[PDB]
Amino acid sequence: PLVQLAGIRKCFDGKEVIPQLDLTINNGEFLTLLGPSGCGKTTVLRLIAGLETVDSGRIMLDNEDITHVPAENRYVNTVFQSYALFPHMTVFENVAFGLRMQKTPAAEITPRVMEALRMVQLETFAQRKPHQLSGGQQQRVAIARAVVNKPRLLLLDESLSALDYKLRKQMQNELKALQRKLGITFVFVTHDQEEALTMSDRIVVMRDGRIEQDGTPREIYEEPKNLFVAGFIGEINMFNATVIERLDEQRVRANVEGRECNIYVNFAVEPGQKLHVLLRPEDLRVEEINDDNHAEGLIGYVRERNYKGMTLESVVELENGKMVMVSEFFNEDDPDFDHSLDQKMAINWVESWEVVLA
Amino acid sequence: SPLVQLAGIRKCFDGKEVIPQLDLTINNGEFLTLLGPSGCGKTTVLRLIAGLETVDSGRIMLDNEDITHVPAENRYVNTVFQSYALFPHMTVFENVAFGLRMQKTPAAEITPRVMEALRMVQLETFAQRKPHQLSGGQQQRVAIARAVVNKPRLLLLDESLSALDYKLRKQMQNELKALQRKLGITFVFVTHDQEEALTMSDRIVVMRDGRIEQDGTPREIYEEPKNLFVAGFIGEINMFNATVIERLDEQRVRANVEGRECNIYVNFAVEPGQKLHVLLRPEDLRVEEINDDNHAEGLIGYVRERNYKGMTLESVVELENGKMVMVSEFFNEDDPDFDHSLDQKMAINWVESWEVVLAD
Amino acid sequence: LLRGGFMTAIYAYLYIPIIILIVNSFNSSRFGINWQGFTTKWYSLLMNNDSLLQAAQHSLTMAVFSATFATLIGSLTAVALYRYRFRGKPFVSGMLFVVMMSPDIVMAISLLVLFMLLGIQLGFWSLLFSHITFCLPFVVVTVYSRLKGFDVRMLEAAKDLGASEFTILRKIILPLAMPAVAAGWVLSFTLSMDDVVVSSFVTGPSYEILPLKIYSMVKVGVSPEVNALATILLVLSLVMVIASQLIAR
Amino acid sequence: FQNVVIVTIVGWLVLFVFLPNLMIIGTSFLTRDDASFVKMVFTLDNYTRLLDPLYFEVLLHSLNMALIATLACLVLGYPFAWFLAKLPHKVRPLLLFLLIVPFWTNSLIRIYGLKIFLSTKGYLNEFLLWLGVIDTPIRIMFTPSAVIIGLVYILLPFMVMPLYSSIEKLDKPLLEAARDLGASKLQTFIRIIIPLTMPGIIAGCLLVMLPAMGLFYVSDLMGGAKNLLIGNVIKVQFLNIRDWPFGAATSITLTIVMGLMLLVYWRASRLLN
């Protein structure tokens, strides 16, 4: 139990951004906060970092109250999205700023700074102003500056947004390895589903200052709680279904998008209840119908095939007028799924590979 | 039928020859995309085609007319900029009607043309609203509408959708494809994204350092690269080293690939002791799990990373030699869920005849 | 609560001399040290005074002409620097920056010796050139700073849309620079009216200006018509600045 | 169109600024004449007269009064700009325009008005005595103190404008980073804000110091005969004594200071950019 936030309230210009937040952060884990742009994630990060004071509530770090402790006494460092890098100081002095400011004896300052630079592979750039480096080198300098003070928790604020698509993939693995070797908690904020999903051990989804769900990526991707989460991350398909009658403890018969199949439901239902059926594009089966025999699934059509190389995703427009957007893979039995335009199809799913909400 | 033919074009800039030599032809009625790394000179080509820059040599013809030295005021070519380059003090209506007014179009026809052009992009309501009150998507819509009104023979796009977020960009990609089909004119697109270029284009030209590297259909580019730069530039690749021992049959050659023997498919002639390049994609690898001396055929490696993406699982396997191979597996088949450890010993195979063998 | 006190004190420092001259304009005492009633005799004495009125007219005319010419030339130069790209732009920026960072006495003496060497009588023309020359840099800086906040590729985009070089200027660039030109006009007007050293050096006796007449008359003794004259010019100046604001919008 | 403006703007500055200065610099090489005021005779007699204690104590006495005015402006100007950047954006343009409005009155008339306010029998002496704070009137006229008050009064608006531009262009997250890393406000001021805004300080010091060394009507009205500025000496040598070559020699001692200050601006700007 590292950080406990109890009953935190915050008001900005008379508008409430954090109504009431209770959240616990364990020790030695990589935690990512996910949500849309401008939903108070930055406010929470700045509250933990100490740049602002709560309008109500309590903050506990290691069982010692830091609610009113100034920003000068906390053992937490932050890397900013602006990549704050004082332009009139060399890399050596940039890293050593924090050590000089804490009145450290001078015989240990040089080795600590040099080891911190060697940690992030910056041995050669000892004396270079923060305008002669590249974006990745700037990222490494910011990380080394933050972690040179031996903080008890590192805060990252939208760290790798401004780089290309390849260095990004390199430094994702580099950050996960740095976190594992150091062993300290990492808190990450991103608007991208891929980074949060692929980099974390626990994900917290935020919306208007409230927590929607907190759990491991498997749970959040496979077992959402509401229609907003199931669709905010990844791609979802919304089918309208009306329950008719119950077959057994798990299966129920309903009218889904004008057809009648058997869906798996594990909670009590009554006839006439309007339901929601959610499906991932990869969780859908499609077959061509060239001959006159059109049956076994929703009919639909084909409006646009956007191929992607390793896969091919196609969107199907039903008779009612809703896009379906299926996706398929290239297998040995299925080398290429070359579809024409405006070609009639058949829609199917995999039994029990669906989630039904109320 | 050819529409634009670039013959022997040369360009120099500040004593550095950005474009040594480029020969190219653009057909009429297709969606063409120019792909390359950032800073290779695509924007310079785009500006050269538009007419805002001049060639040191060569000829440019449009419909059998030499427009090499015709000023950029009579060509039927319009360009859409990335920041929308919209006049802030005018309205959307005036922004659209600027080109028409400067061409002395009669006043009884200007208003219906402007109105139908705005309706073609679904901006009927915002005719009289100033800029700085529009979102990014609305600004792209305004820019496209402004470019299209003059009925050009060539609409030039310059990294149109770089600034938007993800979902809006994905929707507007299909919107642009549909609009191109509706109009019937050649679209030329310049982009750095791989999936973005692969999704829309009916024909791709990859340029590097002023030279054309490949040109063809998206399938033709994704599956049969001619060299390593194009193969690694688009998509993800697994580079494999092999040494040829002897040839077995007309499509099978004995080889020593990455430390072990394997039969690969090679059509061209080969000689013993030669070095070849084996190129594979992550989804092409078949990988089993060696728990306790089970299915130990193929390469031997250890897992150093595992990534869950929700629809597929990506794995980084470390061989005994020390080479990192990227493997991707999908959950769509009949294994709903599975998950690997961080030090497991794993076996690597691949399906026959799905190789891409490159000499030298 | 203590932030506003510091701000008020500086303003009181900069306005008290002004407050003294308006009140002393309505005072009855010739010396003006104390307050001995209310009168308007000084206004009547000023209205029948000819040399003072001529000096005021000459100063106002010089200010107006110099402001117009400086505004025009500076706006054109800033547009030229903004619109074109060449190697020497930092060099031109340095010349303007250095000429702004120049002492007044040295500039006055340089123009004095230049006019004496060429053989031009000192008077209207020399004063006009001096005021435009030392008013240019501020106008250039203001208009350029305003213009640099807009994208430059906008002009080429308009060019693709079918606009000549002359048409872009009237239809596009000018409406985005009008508040800066007007702002540069008022700033140029103010500087050309508070300068003393160059005018006191580069002028002659054919053209008499207001600073010289008051400087000559101060030694014997300043009657309150000058106090009366200061407040008349302030009201006339308060209506010229507001007219500029109305026209640009 | 393209070439006309470049030639014209270059032609105007050269014809009216740079060429006349080189003659001034070369006007101290010739001798004195009672006709055309010059003669082609290389001489260095003008300079050795500068080292005369009579003409050397005046130069030193002028620099002391100009430095204190610059420091008083800097102590009073940097905080003034700091409070202005912490105000609502809708009132900032109005307050800047309220600093230039005293300029609508001639500079020579504003100093004369200040003389009556601070006189011995005038206000600030009757009012300060009427509400007991002092027992006898405070006499500052015809003293070096009086001159410093005048220099600050006229030139104060020339220092606020350059500082506001430099202060307003600072990066807010940059200053916030030090607070997180563990720097207090006092420590943040010395090691971050000042080095970043140094080019603003240097530019502001140039616009208030050099003009303050040539204003001769301030000393004439408020200083007396013992407290003179370089502006009073040069005016006499050109209009009354008509000794042009010596006046040009005195002016270079003022231009030399310009060269020293310009180097600091470029190196402080080059180090930052």
Residue numbers in the entry:
A (entry chain D): 16 to 373
B (entry chain A): 15 to 374
C (entry chain C): 5 to 253
D (entry chain B): 7 to 279
Question: What sentences appear in the manuscript?
Answer:
However, no ligand was observed in the structure; perhaps because of flexibility, this further corroborates the necessity of the E to Q mutation (E173Q).
